Amino acid sequence: AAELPPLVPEPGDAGQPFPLTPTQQALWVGRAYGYFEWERPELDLARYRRAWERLVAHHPGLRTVVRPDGTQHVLERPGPVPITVEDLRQDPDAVRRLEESRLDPGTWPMFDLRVVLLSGRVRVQLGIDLQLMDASSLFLNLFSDLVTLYDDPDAALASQKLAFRDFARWLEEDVRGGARWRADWAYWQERLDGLPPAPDLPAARKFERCMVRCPAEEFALLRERALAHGLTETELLVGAFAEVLRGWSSDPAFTLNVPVFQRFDVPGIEDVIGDYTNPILLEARPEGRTVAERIVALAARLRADTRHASVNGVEVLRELARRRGLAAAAMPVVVTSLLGLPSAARSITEFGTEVHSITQTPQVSLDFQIRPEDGELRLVWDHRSGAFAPGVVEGAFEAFLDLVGRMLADEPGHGVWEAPFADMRSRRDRAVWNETNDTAEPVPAVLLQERFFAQARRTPDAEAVVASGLRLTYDELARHAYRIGNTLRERGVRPGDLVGVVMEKGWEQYAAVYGILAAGGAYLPIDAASPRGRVARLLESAGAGIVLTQSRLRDELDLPAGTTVLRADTDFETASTAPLTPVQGPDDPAYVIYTGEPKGVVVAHRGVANLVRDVRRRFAVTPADRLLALSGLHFDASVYDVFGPLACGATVVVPPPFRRAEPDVWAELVRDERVTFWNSVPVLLELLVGEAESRDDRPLATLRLAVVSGDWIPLDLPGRARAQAPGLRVVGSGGPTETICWSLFHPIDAVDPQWTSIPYGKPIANQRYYIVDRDLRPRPTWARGEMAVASPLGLALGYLNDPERTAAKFVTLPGTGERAYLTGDFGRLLPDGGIEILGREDFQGQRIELGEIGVRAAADVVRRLLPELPLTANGKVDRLALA
Numbered sequence: 007a008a009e010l011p012p013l014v015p016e017p018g019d020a021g022q023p024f025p026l027t028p029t030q031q032a033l034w035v036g037r038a039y040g041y042f043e044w045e046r047p048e049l050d051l052a053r054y055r056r057a058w059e060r061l062v063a064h065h066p067g068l069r070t071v072v073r074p075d076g077t078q079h080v081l082e083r084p085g086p087v088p089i090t091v092e093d094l095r096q097d098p099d100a101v102r103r104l105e106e107s108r109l110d111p112g113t114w115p116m117f118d119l120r121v122v123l124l125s126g127r128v129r130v131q132l133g134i135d136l137q138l139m140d141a142s143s144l145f146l147n148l149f150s151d152l153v154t155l156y157d158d159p160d161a162a163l164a165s166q167k168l169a170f171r172d173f174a175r176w177l178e179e180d181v182r183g184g185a186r187w188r189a190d191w192a193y194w195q196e197r198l199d200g201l202p203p204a205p206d207l208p209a210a211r212k213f214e215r216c217m218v219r220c221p222a223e224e225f226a227l228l229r230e231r232a233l234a235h236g237l238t239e240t241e242l243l244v245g246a247f248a249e250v251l252r253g254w255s256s257d258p259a260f261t262l263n264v265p266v267f268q269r270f271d272v273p274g275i276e277d278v279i280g281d282y283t284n285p286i287l288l289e290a291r292p293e294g295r296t297v298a299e300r301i302v303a304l305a306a307r308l309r310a311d312t313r314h315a316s317v318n319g320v321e322v323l324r325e326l327a328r329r330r331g332l333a334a335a336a337m338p339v340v341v342t343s344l345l346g347l348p349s350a351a352r353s354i355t356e357f358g359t360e361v362h363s364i365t366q367t368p369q370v371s372l373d374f375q376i377r378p379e380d381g382e383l384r385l386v387w388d389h390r391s392g393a394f395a396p397g398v399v400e401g402a403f404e405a406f407l408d409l410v411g412r413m414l415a416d417e418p419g420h421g422v423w424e425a426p427f428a429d430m431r432s433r434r435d436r437a438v439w440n441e442t443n444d445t446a447e448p449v450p451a452v453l454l455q456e457r458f459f460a461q462a463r464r465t466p467d468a469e470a471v472v473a474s475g476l477r478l479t480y481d482e483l484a485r486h487a488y489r490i491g492n493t494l495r496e497r498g499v500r501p502g503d504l505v506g507v508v509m510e511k512g513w514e515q516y517a518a519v520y521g522i523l524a525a526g527g528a529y530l531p532i533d534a535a536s537p538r539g540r541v542a543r544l545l546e547s548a549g550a551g552i553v554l555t556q557s558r559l560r561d562e563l564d565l566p567a568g569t570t571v572l573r574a575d576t577d578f579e580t581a582s583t584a585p586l587t588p589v590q591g592p593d594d595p596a597y598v599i600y601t602g603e604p605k606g607v608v609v610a611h612r613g614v615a616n617l618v619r620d621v622r623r624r625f626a627v628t629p630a631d632r633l634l635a636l637s638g639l640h641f642d643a644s645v646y647d648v649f650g651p652l653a654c655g656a657t658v659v660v661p662p663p664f665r666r667a668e669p670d671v672w673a674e675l676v677r678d679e680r681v682t683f684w685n686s687v688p689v690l691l692e693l694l695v696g697e698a699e700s701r702d703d704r705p706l707a708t709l710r711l712a713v714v715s716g717d718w719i720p721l722d723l724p725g726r727a728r729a730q731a732p733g734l735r736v737v738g739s740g741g742p743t744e745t746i747c748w749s750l751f752h753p754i755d756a757v758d759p760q761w762t763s764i765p766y767g768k769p770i771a772n773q774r775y776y777i778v779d780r781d782l783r784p785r786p787t788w789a790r791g792e793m794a795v796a797s798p799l800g801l802a803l804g805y806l807n808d809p810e811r812t813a814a815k816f817v818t819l820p821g822t823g824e825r826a827y828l829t830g831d832f833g834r835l836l837p838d839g840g841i842e843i844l845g846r847e848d849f850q851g852q853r854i855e856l857g858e859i860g861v862r863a864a865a866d867v868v869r870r871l872l873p874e875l876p877l878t879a880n881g882k883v884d885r886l887a888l889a
């Protein structure tokens with residue numbers, strides 16, 4: 007170690023100023039205060055006055071003021087003690103007037119006394135500055151003596167050696183810079199680059215207090231638990247607190263201010279009112295497998311942070327601001343612990359029983375206070391209401407109390423102690439997620455091509471496909487599907503093969519899909535606009551043989567000779583209109599769709615069929631509904647346009663092929679065919695509604711359902727669309743291609759203005775949406791995390807054939823065992839249950855949050871400005887081309 011210089015007392019010349027202490031320096035600039043309240047039957051005010059008159063002397067603090075020159079001197083003739091008695095005994099509505107309630111160091115009384123007189127009862131209130139003295143002083147000296155002094159104001163008091171002004175000049179001059187000081191600034195200079203920012207907890211873009219009183223018996227068990235791991239009553243208590251926090255914490259590592267109220271064991275200093283406040287920056291990095299392990303390890307780093315106490319935290323934090331940014335250093339999370347200081351003479355409880363007590367420490371968002379009191383350990387969480395999203399503190403406190411409770415119930419080395427983690431979600435956190443994720447419904451085994459075949463037999467007259475003017479009935483499509491599918495099986499389209507379907511938008515694709523499924527295979531959609539090289543590339547990498555195509559642009563297909571190619575509009579006509587029989591199963595693949603290297607997606611039958619018959623049972627999909635099949639069949643979004651409508655008698659309406667979005671034709675074709683179902687990415691319905699508003703007719707007037715998904719549903723768009731056809735119910739969805747087109751549905755009924763984004767929603771039937779930390783564990787509400795869509799049948803079979811990708815992105819959760827897809831999107835659960843979608847590794851997102859109230863950063867805007875934003879291949883918003 008290193009011994010320190012001795013304190014030089016000065017019996018006199020105390021009237022002359024001494025500089026402000028570091029903990030105090032930081033409060034006298036933020037001005038550019040605590041409060042208590044006890045009750046008791048009768049307060050003898052004269053006695054009380056004289057007590058407080060003697061309490062204003064003795065301690066050189068209760069008189070000190072701050073000269074506006076930035077220094078503090080003592081006073082010696084202050085005035086009389088300003089006690090402000092209020093009277094409300096014969097006042098009815100006395101609780102009401104008492105209710106409305108709540109300072110400068112330039113002006114003597116560094117506080118604010120009061121005494122409100124209610125009927126039969128007296129309510130003593132004490133303001134106080136927090137620049138004036140510190141927590142330990144307040145409880146160990148002021149209150150203690152004040153009890154002594156209310157009892158007998160003339161009672162003997164203690165001889166005040168070496169007044170505080172001395173300690174002040176002492177640490178400032180004699181102690182700073184010396185042996186122990188120089189030794190200790192190294193530690194923090196050799197860790198200042200290892201310090202993790204403060205707890206990053208959720209916000210929601212005055213002071214409230216949860217507290218709990220532990221009885222004496224429960225105290226002592228608590229302490230006993232602490233020693234049995236070699237910890238102190240405050241050692242374990244910080245450790246637990248770190249755990250709770252990690253739950254909602256948006257990273258496991260953070261830094262906890264743990265101030266220490268040291269006086270360097272000076273003789274007589276435990277009787278001086280002063281600011282002995284030394285912050286310590288405890289680094290919380292989860293070190294260990296178990297609680298017992300991780301709490302014991304953080305306890306270690308605390309003590310080591312403590313043997314180096316001479317360098318005040320204020321400096322360390324300063325130098326921290328120097329190395330990094332200023333704001334990127336704030337320590338809003340603190341743990342004030344008056345355990346382990348001496349047992350004072352008197353306990354404020356003797357005087358009167360509390361009623362109110364809120365520390366107003368500023369720049370502190372959450373203040374875990376640990377103080378003992380007449381036998382009990384008082385735990386208290388004082389938190390700045392509005393620093394965090396709703397409930398976040400109510401929930402962590404519930405979870406905290408459980409954690410400590412189990413520790414009161416588990417013999418060390420057993421139970422929670424040797425538990426690898428602890429689920430912080432509160433009873434509601436759970437109730438809401440269970441209740442919103444209870445999606446358990448059996449899917450009837452029916453081949454996706456069988457369902458359609460059976461509706462075609464059910465309503466063969468009906469309009470199945472309307473494409474490029476040439477319409478098609480359900481029987482004529484079915485008959486041409488039989489034609490194709492028979493032809494395929496004949497050429498050996500064995501069960502489980504992939505028949506690549508490469509064409510443009512038209513009625514050829516539809517029959518192509520249902521003949522290929524019929525033939526016992528799965529269809530592999532490839533865009534006819536891709537480069538003449540990438541097409542054959544995807545086909546070769548998927549190992550696909552036969553390829554169906556339209557005859558137009560059939561020669562513009564550079565494919566090999568081992569891969570057969572047939573036209574659909576002609577190279578089929580001379581076939582069997584006799585139905586083929588289902589050879590393939592419900593768990594066999596129906597389509598592979600492709601998406602740093604592109605990955606193919608394998609999708610079953612069972613899941614798509616789950617989709618189809620939910621969407622029908624969600625929005626009452628009736629055969630009257632006529633749908634604008636806008637998405638390209640190579641985009642995952644097209645799948646409801648294939649199998650959705652035809653599986654209960656609706657009509658599919660194919661628009662003329664495009665490359666650039668053409669909301670003109672779309673408004674036309676929607677206006678003309680009485681289209682009632684719109685399905686695309688949000689920008690496409692935006693462009694449509696923009697073209698439609700600027701028209702005299704009502705073109706989009708028959709629309710009864712609009713499902714946007716895959717991008718960001720623009721905040722205004724639901725109203726702007728709801729503008730035309732009064733009665734359209736807009737709905738937004740999404741979920742990755744590996745999750746069967748739509749997974750989570752949010753009916754867009756009332757865009758909230760203070761929303762950064764449209765809620766992602768509640769899950770559909772059979773899919774469960776989880777929000778997990780880095781450990782694939784469920785998070786509690788609001789918490790950021792990655793999204794895990796859990797599902798036996800509504801999950802993608804696998805990533806093409808590469809098993810690495812598939813077993814790495816499709817995991818088993820350890821909480822349950824559910825096979826889940828790690829979406830690679832990050833979000834947070836919402837206390838109605840829905841999900842808020844936040845981006846994908848977008849944490850460095852505000853942007854639109856502070857934008858619409860125009861794109862994101864990288865910044866770009868459109869109305870480095872630019873005319874209008876660029877799209878991607880199927881629409882959305884090309885955030886990758888923008889830098």
Ligand SMILES: [C][C@]([N])([C][O])C(=O)O=P([O])([O])O[C][C]1O[C](N2[C]=NC3=C2N=[C]N=C3[N])[C]([O])[C]1[O]
Nearest residue numbers: 601642643715716717740741742743744747829830
């Ligand atoms: C499925 C869909 N959504 C359509 O339907 C898609 O998108 O797909 P993809 O892209 O291919 O896959 C994968 C991806 O997805 C994505 N997403 C989706 N959705 C969305 C998203 N993001 C955002 N937002 C929205 N809405 C994801 O991200 C993935 O990974």
